[PDB]
From a paper:
CebE is the sugar-binding component of the ABC transporter, proteins CebF and CebG form the transporter permease, and the energy for active cello-oligosaccharide transport is provided by the multiple sugar importer ATPase MsiK.
We obtained the crystallographic structure of CebEscab in complex with cellotriose at a 1.55-Å resolution. The reducing end (D-Glc1) is more inserted in Domain 2, whereas the non-reducing end (D-Glc3) makes more interactions with Domain 1. Cellotriose is stabilized in the pocket by a few hydrophobic interactions and numerous H-bonds, nine of them being mediated by eight water molecules surrounding the ligand. D-Glc3 provides the highest contribution to the binding of cellotriose, being involved in ten H-bonds and three hydrophobic interactions with the sidechain of W303 (parallel stacking), F70, and M123. D-Glc1 and D-Glc2 follow with 7 and 6 H-bonds, respectively, the latter being involved in an additional hydrophobic interaction with F282.
Numbering used by the authors: 62 to 454
Write the structure that this text describes.
Amino acid sequence: KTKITLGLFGTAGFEESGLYKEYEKLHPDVDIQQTVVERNENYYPALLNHLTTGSGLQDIQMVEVGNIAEIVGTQSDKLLDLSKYGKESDYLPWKWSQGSTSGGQTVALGTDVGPMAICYRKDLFEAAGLPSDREEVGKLWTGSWDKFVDAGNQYKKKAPKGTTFLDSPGGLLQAILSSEKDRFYDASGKVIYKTNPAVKSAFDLTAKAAKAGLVGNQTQFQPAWDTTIANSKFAAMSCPPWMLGYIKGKSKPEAAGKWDIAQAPKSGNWGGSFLSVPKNGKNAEEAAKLAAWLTAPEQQAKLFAVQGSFPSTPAAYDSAAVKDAKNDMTGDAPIGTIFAEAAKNIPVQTIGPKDQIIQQGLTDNGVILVTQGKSASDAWKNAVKTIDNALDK
Ligand SMILES: OC[C@H]1O[C@@H](O[C@H]2[C@H](O)[C@@H](O)[C@H](O[C@H]3[C@H](O)[C@@H](O)[C@H](O)O[C@@H]3CO)O[C@@H]2CO)[C@H](O)[C@@H](O)[C@@H]1O
């Protein structure tokens, strides 16, 4: 009889994991609903406007790591201190810190983290003459993104008709960038995306792959890209664990069991989110309890076991739910073992308030231009112009 609504983006996985049903069994007086804006690009500016005005908010709001520093910095007075509801000792300290203010309030509780790996179609790799065993696949490119592109060139030589090695240029760039500790900001808060040699180098390698026909001409997280998943149009993609939510959500039933997961060239992090509670909502108390419960170790373990998003709560890593986890898309692959290995040297990244919009510009206003037939130099100039306009106004 008390309705609690979550405002989400993407595929958080709470509903699919049965977590709302579990909670409603514990608390029969609670009715959980959600509203979803598919792309964070569309979700976040609306969230910010809703927080500013106090109008249009849900009882709980999700926040991506690309935006969390802006939410903590400018909207913390509008958010409940969840340090009294969730336990600091449950979370990775660096994760806890991302959602916390200098005043000692924790206004966002961590969901997942994004240790980098590569998800691939065993059948398409086998058809092209590549290994399909995950250890052998990982050995193709251990320690080197150049060896990853070389493996793509080999795939292209024998590729099944109408398939590309990878789904998108954006996904490849995000993967290459994921191994950097300082991507777009340094520890002093300086925006470094234009001067960090690793960013330009990742962009140019992505452009090389694009020019060589290794990647689909697709922006990620759009209906046409969903169709490329459905119709088996690519052999591999960058796979932080939450990408499994997308693969499972957009695949045809026939693809169940046909994917597997290899270690990436380098350890990396792409993504991670949080739940926050607007403090002035009529249900803030119940919302805070629900938010803390959804992000507690047991519930993070359950979500991993069903949807594949990897916990930010280390006690979960020793649970059977994680250790023995499988995913429908990956058959009998031990995804707990695989992602534990991918997470062992996960970089603790310097974040900043405009990470999200920088990422967006480098991908959707950057490397996509190369698959559209622009030079790498034109693509970079376009990205810089686009990002700088966002940062400067
Ligand atoms: O699905 C749940 C997981 O979401 C992860 O965030 C991703 C968003 O779901 C997705 O909408 C967004 O897509 C971006 C894309 O990365 C960017 O290159 C393009 O220009 O714009 C798209 C639309 O915003 O990507 C993010 C990842 O950066 C969370 O990281 C994860 O915690 C969560 O479980």
